[PDB]
């Protein structure tokens, strides 16, 4: 079962370095190539480099001289510096893998989630989960709608999970901005009314940025 | 240093009814191997991207017969018919003939279905954010058609828009609606002064406005 991952540092400062590695598995890099592509915010997708499978690399050409697409084949690892950091290289990072045939890859086959890099001054604020839960005095029919407004965070993103993933029923999300020089995202969840408070649903927050993550319960009041 | 635009930039459509990209590159895309190595490529809202079509015309597993994928050198053109919630996200050409391969700045998807009313909920801020000097009253209004909405907080009578944030969400793939979330936070102090708490709303569905007030008794 084939796998790529990324891992990343969430923020850097402006003006300094980044280096990103592609954790693989199911393959390998000595029988396949893997691209570079990435995600300016609010943008669309730009391919940032390629080591085919021999050690070579090709390179986009606006920064090939701040890129540099290595790689350890035993270690199945793709690592990827990047010089003089800039504040519109904020994008999401990709290790996506090649599916064609020799040297000219049909299309990239199997792409990572993403690691994601914010370029700015600010340092990691930690985020603040707080439950989104009803009041008292308004009630519900069929069905119940809860949530979590978690609020506070720097940098991007964070990642909601709702009892347990074995909620999936009417799942919302809405995109964070910022306030005060932080983000802050909500997260709603929809489930029917014999079931909460009837059952004890639960909010669970990731964010690698400070890696940390909270599950908040759910009560009224 | 291989140009290839797309447009529309965005493409309204509705569910059943067909959608056509055309792909446009500055030079040509065909290989020496005459092998043209054009692809689309998808990325659903919070999703990864995906491959869809590998070689112009060449779909990719999964990827229903719905998919088209034509096209000569400067013109290319992707076309899906039989439109669903899931079409939804932005589709991406990708040349890999010549170096640097290249993108185009994809296209948004867009489809129109039947209007669908909002469903509105308050929730009185935390007990323990309370005591973390702030005071947060966040409304929720989900699942409605068209995405054009007015939301306005009153606290006691008049309304507040002061620093007010609203957050939409794209279109969803299974219903293929938009739905957003406004918060209206303050200082404890002025929750400490304050009973009730309304969220109105007003939508193209309901002539009259959607209202989730609540009082702090």
């Known amino acids: 079962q084939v796998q790529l991952k990324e891992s990343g540092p969430g923020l850097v400062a402006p003006s300094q370095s980044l280096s990103i590695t592609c954790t693989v598995s199911?393959?390998?890099?000595?029988?396949?190539?893997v691209d570079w592509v990435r995600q300016p915010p609010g943008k669309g997708l730009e391919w940032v480099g390629v080591?085919?499978?021999?050690?070579?690399?090709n390179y986009n050409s606006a920064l090939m001289s701040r890129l540099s697409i290595s790689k350890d084949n035993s270690k199945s690892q793709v690592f990827l510096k990047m010089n003089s950091l800039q504040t519109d290289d904020t994008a999401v990072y990709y290790c996506?893998?090649?599916?064609?045939?020799?040297?000219?890859?049909?299309?990239?086959?199997?792409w990572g989630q993403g690691t994601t890099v914010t370029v700015s001054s600010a340092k990691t604020t930690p985020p603040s989960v707080y439950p989104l839960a009803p009041g008292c005095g308004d009630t519900t029919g069929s069905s119940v709608t809860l949530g979590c407004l978690v609020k506070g965070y720097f940098p991007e993103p964070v990642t909601v999970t709702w009892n347990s993933g074995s909620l999936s029923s009417s799942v919302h999300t809405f995109p964070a901005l910022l306030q005060s020089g932080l983000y802050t995202m909500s997260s709603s969840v929809t489930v029917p009314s014999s079931t909460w408070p009837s059952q004890t649903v639960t909010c669970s927050v990731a964010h690698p940025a400070s890696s940390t993550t909270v599950d908040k319960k759910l009560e009224p009041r | 240093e291989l140009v290839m635009t797309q447009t529309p930039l965005s493409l309204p459509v509705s569910l059943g009814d067909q959608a056509s990209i055309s792909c446009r590159s500055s030079?040509?895309?065909?290989?020496?191997?005459?092998?043209?190595?054009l692809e689309w490529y998808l990325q659903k809202p919070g999703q990864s991207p995906k491959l869809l079509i590998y070689?112009?015309?060449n779909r990719f597993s999964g990827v229903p017969d719905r998919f088209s994928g034509s096209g000569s050198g400067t013109d290319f053109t992707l076309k899906i018919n039989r439109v669903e919630a899931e079409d939804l996200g932005v589709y991406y050409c990708?040349?890999?003939?010549?170096?640097?391969?290249?993108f185009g700045g994809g296209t948004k998807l867009e489809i129109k279905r039947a209007d669908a009313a909002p469903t509105v909920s308050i929730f009185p801020p935390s007990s323990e954010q309370l005591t973390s000097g702030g005071a947060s009253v966040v409304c929720f209004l989900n699942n409605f058609y068209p995405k054009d909405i007015n939301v306005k907080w009153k606290i006691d009578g008049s309304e507040r828009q002061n620093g007010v944030l609203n957050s939409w969400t794209d279109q969803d793939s299974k219903d293929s609606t938009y739905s957003m979330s406004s918060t209206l936070t303050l200082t404890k102090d002025e929750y400490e002064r304050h009973n009730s708490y309304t969220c109105e709303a007003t939508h193209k569905t309901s002539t009259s406005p959607i209202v989730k007030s609540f009082n702090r008794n």
């Open positions: 996506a893998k090649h599916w064609g045939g020799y040297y000219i890859p049909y299309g990239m086959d199997h």
């Open positions: 030079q040509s895309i065909v290989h020496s191997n005459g092998n043209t190595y």
């Open positions: 199911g393959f390998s890099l000595t029988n396949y190539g």
């Open positions: 070689k112009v015309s």
């Open positions: 990708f040349q890999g003939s010549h170096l640097p391969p290249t």
């Open positions: 080591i085919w499978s021999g050690g070579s690399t």
